[PDB]
Every structure is written in structure tokens, then in C-alpha cells.
Amino acid sequence: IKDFLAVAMKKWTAPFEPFQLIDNIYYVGTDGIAVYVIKTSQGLILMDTAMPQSTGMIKDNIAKLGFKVADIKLILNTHAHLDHTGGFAEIKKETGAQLVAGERDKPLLEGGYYPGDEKNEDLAFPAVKVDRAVKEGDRVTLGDTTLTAHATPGHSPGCTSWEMTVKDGKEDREVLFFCSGTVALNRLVGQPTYAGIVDDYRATFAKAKAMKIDVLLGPHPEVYGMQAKRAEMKDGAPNPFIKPGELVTYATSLSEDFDKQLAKQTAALEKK
Ligand SMILES: [Zn+2]
Ligand SMILES: [Zn+2]
Ligand SMILES: [Zn+2]
């Protein structure tokens, strides 16, 4: 946790210039937390926020593109940890937007706590009410734009990956805002962070490998190597964010890391 907090006041708060990523999806996060605006014909969708102390920064980034924070109608969450939820209560109150999140993450959101470590104030965030609790396959529509919820638990109990279609020239491309599949601070064994966590992770890796996704996105830019792609982006060159093999490759890496951490945490149960 100490190192988690160290990273959270370093790459996670460092600037990154907002940009149009593909079609109606805009990057407005930091160098280390990815946040998105999705422009629809009936207002904006905000996909996540960042650390609680970074809300003004995210609002400023939205402005740099000429979007209005006031025009946010829906706030969607990938998963309910403070580095993604820290601005929800504030932006919701300022805008009147509705918050949409995976049903099993509702208790987290509504209590502002880290599951299985509820007394840790360093992982707390301002509590926020969930307006629509989603399940696998639910469709969330604003104007011309529809995202589909995919239940991909593990990193959190209600982790939701959100799929949408965009255009690249005349052709459709499928985008996935992947929710996260890292072990990170979670306990897998002993006193697991929540019941059924291990089966959820391995179900999620399998699910992720079976999806047909052209553009992998996630809640940190390292999920999809954002910075290297942004540097390659040129008017009249293919959009570097289109890499259809990427979610299978990434979920394979996550599964291998999972196995290593499950084995480390299992070895650590043996009390010396
Ligand atoms: Zn997380
Ligand atoms: Zn995170
Ligand atoms: Zn699904």
C-alpha cells in the first residue's frame, strides 16, 4: 500500500495532453490514470475519474478539448477503486449526471471504501450513489451512442468492461474499455478480498480472450500502451489504437501474472 500511494502521487497525477483517440472517444486522463469523454448527439458520457485530488485536473482536461463539464449526462465506472472514482461525488453533484456501474460494485461506491480493507482511509473516496446498477449485456444509450456492459469481475466484484462501436473511415471498429484484471492490492487467499475472487479472475481472463475487440482501452494507459500509440498518431496514417490481437495478448499476460501472485500469496499463508 505504501508503494501504491507513492505511484498515486507520481505517474498517476502527472499531466498528459488530452486528445481525440478514435471517433467520438477522447482521452482526458493523466499520464498514469486513463479517463475518457464519449461525445454523443445528446450530451457527454464520462468514463471514470481519477484520484480524489485530481478532479480539477480532469475537469480542466475536458475543457482543453472544448467540452463542457456541464454537458456530462452519464458517468460510467469500470471499477470502484479510488483512483477511478475519486471525482464521482463532485462531478455528479455539479452536473446532475447519473452514475452507472456494475451491480456488485454498488456497495463499494456507496460506502467509499476498499473491499476487504474498509478501515484504510488512504484507499477511501467520497461516497456516491449509483443511479443504474448494471448486469452483463445491459445497454446504456445516450443519443446516438450505446455502450454494452460486460461483467468481468476479479479486480473488483463489480468490475465492468464496456463495449461500443466506432467508425474508422467507413468501417465499424469494436472498442472495449477493459475494466482491469491486475491483482494489485487484492488478497486472493487466506482472507480473500471478497468471496469468489479467484474464480472471477480466471473466468474474466477466459471471457476477455473470447471477445472480438479492435481497440483495447483500460483504466490506466499501460493497459494498452497509450503513450507509444499517441506518439505514432499522424493525420493520414492508420489509427495506432486499432490492434485487434491486443486483448488476447494482454489477458494472457494478466493470467500469467495472476498465477505468480496466487502462488506467492499461497506460500505466504505458511506462518513462520
Ligand atoms: Zn483498481
Ligand atoms: Zn486503477
Ligand atoms: Zn459479455
Side-chain angles (χ1 to χ4, degrees), residues 1 3-9 11-120 122-231 233 236-242 244-259 261-270:
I1 303 167
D3 187 54
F4 179 89
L5 295 167
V7 173
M9 63 178 62
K11 195 183 185 54
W12 287 5
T13 65
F16 198 83
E17 188 68 9
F19 64 102
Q20 181 179 21
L21 189 158
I22 181 157
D23 199 6
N24 61 325
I25 301 175
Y26 302 78
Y27 193 92
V28 294
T30 73
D31 195 51
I33 293 168
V35 182
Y36 313 84
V37 167
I38 298 165
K39 180 189 178 283
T40 86
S41 61
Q42 295 296 331
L44 306 175
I45 298 172
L46 182 67
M47 180 67 73
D48 289 330
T49 59
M51 294 286 291
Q53 58 261 54
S54 292
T55 307
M57 187 181 182
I58 302 306
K59 290 192 289 180
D60 291 348
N61 288 341
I62 292 165
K64 297 171 194 298
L65 294 172
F67 290 120
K68 295 294 278 165
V69 169
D71 290 343
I72 296 166
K73 311 293 193 185
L74 296 176
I75 300 169
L76 275 53
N77 189 208
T78 49
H79 76 271
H81 292 158
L82 82 164
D83 52 321
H84 313 293
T85 66
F88 286 173
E90 178 169 341
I91 289 178
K92 169 167 172 187
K93 182 176 167 193
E94 170 177 351
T95 63
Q98 295 181 277
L99 174 66
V100 182
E103 67 184 353
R104 291 184 182 176
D105 273 356
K106 183 175 167 172
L108 289 52
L109 289 161
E110 305 205 337
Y113 63 79
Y114 198 96
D117 195 14
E118 304 200 27
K119 286 194 301 208
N120 188 341
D122 287 299
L123 300 173
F125 55 90
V128 66
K129 289 189 179 290
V130 172
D131 301 291
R132 176 175 179 190
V134 295
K135 46 259 165 41
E136 167 73 24
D138 288 352
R139 293 165 77 221
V140 172
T141 301
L142 180 67
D144 62 359
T145 292
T146 299
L147 296 98
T148 300
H150 297 271
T152 50
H155 184 89
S156 74
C159 206
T160 302
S161 293
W162 290 101
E163 184 164 335
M164 66 176 275
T165 308
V166 300
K167 302 303 297 188
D168 173 56
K170 51 210 198 174
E171 291 170 333
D172 290 353
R173 297 286 184 169
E174 292 294 301
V175 181
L176 191 69
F177 297 89
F178 181 60
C179 80
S180 174
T182 60
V183 176
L185 296 180
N186 287 331
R187 302 186 308 265
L188 300 178
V189 288
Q191 299 294 120
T193 285
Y194 70 87
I197 190 171
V198 168
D199 282 325
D200 286 343
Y201 273 104
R202 286 178 192 296
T204 284
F205 303 145
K207 186 172 166 83
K209 285 174 93 169
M211 299 174 156
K212 299 280 184 148
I213 292 304
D214 300 284
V215 177
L216 177 64
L217 303 175
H220 296 277
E222 296 92 343
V223 165
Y224 57 102
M226 181 280 282
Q227 294 89 336
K229 285 162 167 165
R230 173 59 179 153
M233 154 182 264
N239 188 315
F241 296 89
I242 301 168
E246 197 172 355
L247 177 54
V248 165
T249 307
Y250 183 66
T252 301
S253 300
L254 289 175
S255 187
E256 295 168 348
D257 184 69
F258 182 87
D259 294 342
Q261 298 315 311
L262 182 57
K264 172 173 168 168
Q265 292 189 27
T266 298
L269 294 175
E270 293 189 60

